[PDB]
Design an enzyme around this catalytic site. Sequence first.
Site, short mmCIF file in Angstrom:
data_model
loop_
_atom_site.label_atom_id
_atom_site.label_comp_id
_atom_site.label_asym_id
_atom_site.label_seq_id
_atom_site.Cartn_x
_atom_site.Cartn_y
_atom_site.Cartn_z
N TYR A 36 -1.24 7.58 -12.31
CA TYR A 36 0.05 7.10 -12.67
C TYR A 36 0.46 7.31 -14.19
O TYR A 36 -0.14 7.13 -15.19
CB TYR A 36 0.05 5.64 -12.52
CG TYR A 36 -0.08 5.17 -11.21
CD1 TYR A 36 0.75 5.34 -10.17
CD2 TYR A 36 -1.31 4.43 -10.63
CE1 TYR A 36 0.65 4.83 -8.72
CE2 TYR A 36 -1.73 4.13 -9.54
CZ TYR A 36 -0.68 4.22 -8.35
OH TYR A 36 -0.86 3.78 -7.21
N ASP A 62 4.22 4.85 -3.31
CA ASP A 62 3.11 3.98 -2.56
C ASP A 62 3.41 2.61 -2.85
O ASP A 62 4.45 2.14 -3.54
CB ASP A 62 1.46 4.18 -3.12
CG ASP A 62 1.57 3.79 -4.63
OD1 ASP A 62 0.71 4.66 -5.39
OD2 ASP A 62 2.04 2.95 -5.16
N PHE A 64 1.82 0.00 -4.38
CA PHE A 64 1.32 -0.75 -5.55
C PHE A 64 2.43 -0.66 -6.85
O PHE A 64 2.48 -1.72 -7.39
CB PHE A 64 0.40 0.15 -6.16
CG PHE A 64 -0.96 -0.09 -5.20
CD1 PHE A 64 -1.35 1.13 -4.26
CD2 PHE A 64 -1.87 -1.10 -4.82
CE1 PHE A 64 -2.21 1.07 -3.23
CE2 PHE A 64 -2.63 -1.04 -3.95
CZ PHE A 64 -3.01 -0.10 -2.88
N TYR A 65 2.94 0.59 -6.91
CA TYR A 65 3.90 0.70 -7.87
C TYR A 65 5.27 1.40 -7.51
O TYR A 65 6.09 1.61 -8.24
CB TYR A 65 3.33 1.65 -9.14
CG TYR A 65 2.19 0.98 -9.90
CD1 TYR A 65 0.92 1.33 -9.80
CD2 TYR A 65 2.55 -0.16 -10.67
CE1 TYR A 65 -0.09 0.97 -10.60
CE2 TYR A 65 1.41 -0.89 -11.32
CZ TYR A 65 0.21 -0.36 -11.02
OH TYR A 65 -0.85 -0.90 -11.78
N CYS A 97 -5.20 6.40 -8.13
CA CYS A 97 -5.27 5.77 -6.80
C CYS A 97 -5.52 6.82 -5.90
O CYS A 97 -5.45 8.09 -6.25
CB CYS A 97 -3.64 5.48 -6.56
SG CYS A 97 -3.20 4.42 -4.87
N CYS A 103 -6.27 1.53 -4.18
CA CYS A 103 -5.89 1.87 -5.77
C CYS A 103 -6.97 1.44 -6.70
O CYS A 103 -7.76 0.50 -6.29
CB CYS A 103 -4.81 0.90 -6.30
SG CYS A 103 -4.03 1.35 -7.63
#
Length: 119
Positions: A36, A62, A64-65, A97, A103
């Site tokens: 990231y 994704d 997660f973020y 990730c 992740c």
Amino acid sequence: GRSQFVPADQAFAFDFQQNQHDLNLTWQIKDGYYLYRKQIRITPEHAKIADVQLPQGVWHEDEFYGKSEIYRDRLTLPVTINQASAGATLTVTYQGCADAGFCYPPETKTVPLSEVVAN
């Protein structure tokens, strides 16, 4: 690929090379893995560096973020050391990730900086 659990250091192989004022940070990023852009943090200790400009990556989604700028294949990041005292360090923290879903937690490396007298 159920052994898709490759350790962070094999997914995101970090290394660095310094020649005086010039430091290069490099990650070789395993196919099917990404870093990231927004998770990179570089913090000098007993050294002064120029602001680090992160390069343009690709956009990817994704859970997660959300929609994120990410890096694949390799990341090459130059860092300019204006001064460093003897025993100075650079703390390099990053997160990545796997395409396969999961992740990784953030990783931190400490780079020993060779001394650089100001000017």
